[PDB]
Amino acid sequence: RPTFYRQELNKTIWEVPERYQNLSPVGAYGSVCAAFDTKTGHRVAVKKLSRPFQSIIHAKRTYRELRLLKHMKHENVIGLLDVFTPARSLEEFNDVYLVTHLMGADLNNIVKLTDDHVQFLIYQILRGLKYIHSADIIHRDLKPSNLAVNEDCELKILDFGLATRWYRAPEIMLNWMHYNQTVDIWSVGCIMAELLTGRTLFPGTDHIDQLKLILRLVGTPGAELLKKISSESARNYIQSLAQMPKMNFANVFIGANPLAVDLLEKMLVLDSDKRITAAQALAHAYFAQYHDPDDEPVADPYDQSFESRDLLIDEWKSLTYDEVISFVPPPL
Numbered sequence: 001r002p003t004f005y006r007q008e009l010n011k012t013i014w015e016v017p018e019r020y021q022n023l024s025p026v027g028a029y030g031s032v033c034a035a036f037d038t039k040t041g042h043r044v045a046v047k048k049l050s051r052p053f054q055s056i057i058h059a060k061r062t063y064r065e066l067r068l069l070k071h072m073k074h075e076n077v078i079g080l081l082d083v084f085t086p087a088r089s090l091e092e093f094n095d096v097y098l099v100t101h102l103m104g105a106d107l108n109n110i111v112k113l114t115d116d117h118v119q120f121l122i123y124q125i126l127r128g129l130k131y132i133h134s135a136d137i138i139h140r141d142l143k144p145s146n147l148a149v150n151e152d153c154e155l156k157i158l159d160f161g162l163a164t165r166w167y168r169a170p171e172i173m174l175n176w177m178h179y180n181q182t183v184d185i186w187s188v189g190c191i192m193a194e195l196l197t198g199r200t201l202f203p204g205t206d207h208i209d210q211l212k213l214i215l216r217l218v219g220t221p222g223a224e225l226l227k228k229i230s231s232e233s234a235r236n237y238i239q240s241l242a243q244m245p246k247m248n249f250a251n252v253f254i255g256a257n258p259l260a261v262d263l264l265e266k267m268l269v270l271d272s273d274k275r276i277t278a279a280q281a282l283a284h285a286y287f288a289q290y291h292d293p294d295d296e297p298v299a300d301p302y303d304q305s306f307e308s309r310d311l312l313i314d315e316w317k318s319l320t321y322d323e324v325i326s327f328v329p330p331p332l
């Protein structure tokens, strides 16, 4: 068991093993310090979870986050370098600590991207989404601020706890029945649009505005979609918002590679059953230069059955302790 040391930063008591030195606070992103990992001579990020077991929902949101992190073993998805408690036993266990690579910048703070810069960046998100989606995991919050970039334009999908609405699929904001993985693909269409145009595609001030801007471009729902909607009152409302003067795809992305617009019209589809999947989108001609189908791996089986459970503070806590302890650090 390693030797821990104690220091107070931004009125927070940090306790970490002696391998993490020179902790400086970075941020807005919660309780996060940049640290020098003495093991690997690489700068890392330490996150001290804020009162992880305060209630029942913190204790479950804490277990989930650690389960998710321990699962992600992909090039285009944030990985867990280390997790630790200073705690001796289960009895004295209150503080959880996560270690990740340091993210120099996000899609925003690295942004007139060339057609090839757009191809490469959207390829990597779809490659990261294929993997995530194969484990029946949905991001639900894909936006540029959740996409880390490096010196050499390589991208990781992650999820901080910080506008969402801009990248948010209509079915979520209209409260339709059928959610599916492809809520993320709409987001990738909204993010890619922005990289091509240099402007946010659906800059909504509120969710109703947001939907008026979406319907103006993607059209009013066609019959095949309307069939799947039960309530008269939802079917009316989606049409009450599709009154704004129609806009066409060929004029919004004029200048853009015709295969990028071809891909965007398959992403930005109202019908989430007809929307292209990460897996299908990787095989689109737009990525001809990068698509290797022997190098687009799926995820291992992910035990998601805990999501359904209603347990006590002590069970969620106990389960989380058993994850921290069973964590084998990845090989370099």
Ligand SMILES: CS(=O)(=O)N1CCC[C@H](NC(=O)[C@H](CCC2CCCCC2)NC(=O)c2ccc(CNC(=O)c3cnc4ccccn34)cc2)C1
Pocket (backbone or CB within 6 Å): 026, 027, 029, 032, 045, 046, 047, 061, 062, 064, 065, 066, 068, 069, 072, 077, 078, 098, 100, 101, 102, 103, 104, 132, 137, 138, 139, 157, 158, 159, 160, 161
């Ligand atoms: C309430 S909640 O706790 O349940 N919670 C609420 C919403 C967000 C949480 N999402 C999550 O669980 C995902 C796991 C889900 C998974 C799903 C699909 C594939 C991607 C994500 N956790 C993170 O992404 C994560 C990211 C960074 C860090 C620490 N490193 C830093 O912050 C850092 C590193 N470099 C820098 C530079 C500057 C500032 C900070 N940094 C810790 C966790 C859930």
